[PDB]
Amino acid sequence: VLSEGEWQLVLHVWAKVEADVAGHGQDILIRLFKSHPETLEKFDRFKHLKTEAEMKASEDLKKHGVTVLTALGAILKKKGHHEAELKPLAQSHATKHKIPIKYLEFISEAIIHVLHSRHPGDFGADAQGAMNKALELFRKDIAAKYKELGYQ
Numbered sequence: 001v002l003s004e005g006e007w008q009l010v011l012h013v014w015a016k017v018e019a020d021v022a023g024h025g026q027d028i029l030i031r032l033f034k035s036h037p038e039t040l041e042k043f044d045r046f047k048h049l050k051t052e053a054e055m056k057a058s059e060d061l062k063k064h065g066v067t068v069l070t071a072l073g074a075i076l077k078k079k080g081h082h083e084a085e086l087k088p089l090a091q092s093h094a095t096k097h098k099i100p101i102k103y104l105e106f107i108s109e110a111i112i113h114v115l116h117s118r119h120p121g122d123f124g125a126d127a128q129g130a131m132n133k134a135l136e137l138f139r140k141d142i143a144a145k146y147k148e149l150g151y152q
């Protein structure tokens with residue numbers, strides 16, 4: 001469980017993200033796809049993209065980045081009391097999109113990397129550890145729902 005101090009660090013950097021939701025979503029998805037190409041293959045929408053330049057030029061990709069970060073932001077602002085927000089996410093990602101928990105670990109890594117690149121003054125070690133804990137909590141709670149549903 002995160003402390004109030006930890007949540008403050010998480011939400012302080014997150015408020016910086018929300019000044020450019022779409023730029024962050026691009027950077028995060030591109031990092032994910034480049035670092036872990038098996039993730040790209042889960043997106044029928046995006047698997048035609050073969051280069052970073054093509055990814056950066058895709059408005060559809062940029063749109064989806066906003067969808068992802070918007071959902072994450074709503075979860076983080078619940079500070080742990082996010083069960084209603086995760087239910088539908090866990091359900092779609094387990095049963096429709098077929099996304100393993102490991103891939104949620106991968107996108108967590110991408111998020112943390114992009115936050116450090118874009119917001120280093122608000123993303124020192126204390127904030128990095130707090131964000132790690134927040135995204136761990138996210139994964140933990142999704143993983144429990146996957147397990148309920150027979151997906152992990």
Ligand code: HEM
Nearest residue numbers: 039042043045067068071072088089092097099103104107
């Ligand atoms: C921070 C983690 C993530 C969040 C907050 C998130 C959020 C969302 C949201 C809000 C949607 C649309 C509503 C829905 O279908 O549930 C969606 C769709 C989808 N997500 Fe995620 N997602 C996350 C991670 C991933 C990862 C790691 C993958 C793949 C490796 C993934 C694959 C998909 C796919 C395939 C769709 C459908 C895209 C489409 O329209 O064709 N998601 N996600």
